[PDB]
Symmetry: C3
């Protein structure tokens, strides 16, 4: 699917994405919220907190807020490989789940595949936020045990 652009202004780089990056991993997240990707992104590029992610994906679209080759602060691991080498994808509507979320998860499969192809990132380098810092994210994918299936679709699904 087409990944919509809505990057943060270069003037906030020092706050949202100060460092350049050579993508080597893709980190999947759940927002633990029920807001659309546009809202999630818009908020992330407007507030002045050192919190960010590359792309938000909901049941309808994918919107990019941080240049792919600049780091984001979403893996909570300081300057570890999480925040300094991975591209973060945030799946919307996970708080309450429902068709909206499962639809957004399917779109996220698309996004991860494009990113893997785009930066030549292998399937084994597709990770959960939890693998980097220990935080329970993506909470819904973890609690429902959907990670394994998500991975196989990205890996060999014809979607």
């Amino acid at each position: 699917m087409e990944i919509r652009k809505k990057l943060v202004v270069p003037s906030k780089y020092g706050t949202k994405c100060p460092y350049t990056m050579k993508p080597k991993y893709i980190t999947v997240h759940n927002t633990y919220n029920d807001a659309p990707a546009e809202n999630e992104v818009n908020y992330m590029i407007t507030n002045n907190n050192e919190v960010s992610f590359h792309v938000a994906v909901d049941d309808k679209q994918a919107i990019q807020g941080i240049p792919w080759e600049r780091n984001a602060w979403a893996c909570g691991d300081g300057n570890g490989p999480g925040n300094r080498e991975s591209i973060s994808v945030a799946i919307c509507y996970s708080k309450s789940g429902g068709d909206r979320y499962y639809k957004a998860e399917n779109n996220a499969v698309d996004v991860v595949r494009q990113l893997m192809s785009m930066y030549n990132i292998p399937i084994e380098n597709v990770r959960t936020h939890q693998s980097w810092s220990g935080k329970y994210c993506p909470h819904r994918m973890l609690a429902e045990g959907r990670w394994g299936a998500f991975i196989q679709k990205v890996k060999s699904g014809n979607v």
Copy 2:
């Protein structure tokens, strides 16, 4: 056992428990300190740190510092299910362990069971702090491998 109330004042909600909450999980901690519940709570409800927990439990009593239906900042998972959907129970005297701590842990079984019954929280929703953010808490229960037995006690009594 009775859970005494020594709640934070309303004016400090924005810092200690800014959000209403619908209990879905119970998170167990170890304070890594050798102070009684009254001290742990008195300190937590008075200082101005955005750090808090619902109830402290020692070898003698159980004291609640935050309303059960308001979040607490004890899971370090920011705005995740840990800090927004679980009630935090802290077991005292874990720092040195001993009888005082074991008695406190057993009392915690009862407190946890009371919370489960009160908000119909299944046994599978009784979690450790570590499961939410990775911190080594409850340190003593994890170190001495007492979590399994804990769950069983809570399951029966």
Copy 3:
């Protein structure tokens, strides 16, 4: 091998080692850099950052910057057992890796064993940074699953 004592001046202890410590655990890290043990330590002692580790090791030498019997902030567990009860050992060249790092790791096994027999720290008390805070460290070791073999080398020699 021999560990130098490029220890930070006692005047900076208040930030690198402001707490007396009784060594009970050993935490192994991965610098996530391509700099030698000399520069790592020499750096960690210059800046007045609230970050520090006890000893760094590379394919060449092993250097100590923080007194063994004093705490060091490197496990990111606030004031928990990780930071207040363990000796942090940082292995260099984890970023790029290669012969340097691998040789640096074999050396680290020597440093660990020395610390153990010196402070009677049992093999089960040799942990990763990850076990304390959930952080992915030592990254390369974990990525390559070299930990299980590491603990075995510490046992033997």
